[PDB]
């Protein structure tokens, strides 16, 4: 029911997904405690269906359509 997000610098967060929320909403609290900025970064969905390769996210993309996978966030 969640999201396992890799952050910048070697920081992991996992996020419980409720509803309405974008990735901005479920993650903006995660970054800002880590002194980081949501519109300074890009977020991507990880597929090792090609061996370790990244699928790009809009920040207003859904939370729910991820509820069992793996993301990582990287300065834009």
């Amino acid at each position: 029911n969640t999201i396992r997000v890799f952050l910048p610098n070697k920081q992991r967060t996992v996020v419980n997904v409720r509803n309405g929320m974008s990735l901005h909403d479920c993650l903006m609290k995660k970054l800002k405690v880590r002194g980081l900025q949501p519109e300074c970064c890009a977020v991507f969905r990880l597929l090792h269906e090609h061996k370790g390769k990244k699928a790009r996210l809009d920040w207003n993309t859904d939370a729910a359509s991820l509820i069992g996978e793996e993301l990582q966030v990287d300065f834009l």
């Binding site: 969640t2 610098n9 070697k10 920081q11 992991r12 967060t13 996992v14 419980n16 405690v33 880590r34 002194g35």
Partner: protein, 165 residues
């Protein structure tokens, strides 16, 4: 610069994440957001040495055991935290210290017993009870408030200092 890998363990709700955030960002997190796992990295200066604190904040016991089980053989230093108003979390400490002694291999692993929420007036764990526990483990005990910041640097910097020994 030297990296210190610190792990924060203890019952759900005792303030592991609030202690950490308070260390990291100087902010008290008054909301209760249970943790699955969070790791933070921060550059600090402790006794004149610029260093890196790698801090693994772990899941209370809400729930989520099947997660930190080598992520424990990676930790160099453990903060075992209970809240002074939550007797049950003090009684849980022992399980954590046993998990820790198991997943490493010694009864001298760098460790600190932290009694958090010492700003609350509903104390049910006396200082003396916690001091006895810590004495029997061979480690320091420190009372903390993530709200007010009492003891929070002391708690982390002490754990660093145990690690440097």
């Amino acid at each position: 610069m030297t990296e210190y890998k610190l792990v924060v363990v203890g019952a759900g709700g005792v303030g592991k994440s609030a202690l950490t955030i308070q260390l990291i960002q100087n902010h008290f997190v008054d909301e209760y957001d249970p943790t699955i796992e969070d790791s933070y990295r921060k550059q600090v200066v402790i006794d004149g040495e610029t260093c890196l604190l790698d801090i693994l904040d772990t899941a209370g016991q809400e729930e989520y055991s099947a997660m930190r089980d080598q992520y424990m053989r990676t930790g160099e230093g453990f903060l075992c935290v209970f809240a002074i108003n939550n007797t049950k979390s003090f009684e849980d400490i022992h399980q954590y210290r046993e998990q820790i002694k198991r997943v490493k291999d010694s009864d001298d692993v760098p460790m600190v017993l932290v009694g958090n929420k010492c700003d609350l007036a509903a104390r049910t764990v006396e200082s003396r009870q916690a001091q006895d526990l810590a004495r029997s483990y061979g480690i320091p005990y420190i009372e903390t408030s993530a709200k007010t910041r009492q003891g929070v640097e002391d708690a982390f910097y002490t754990l660093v200092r145990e690690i440097r020994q």
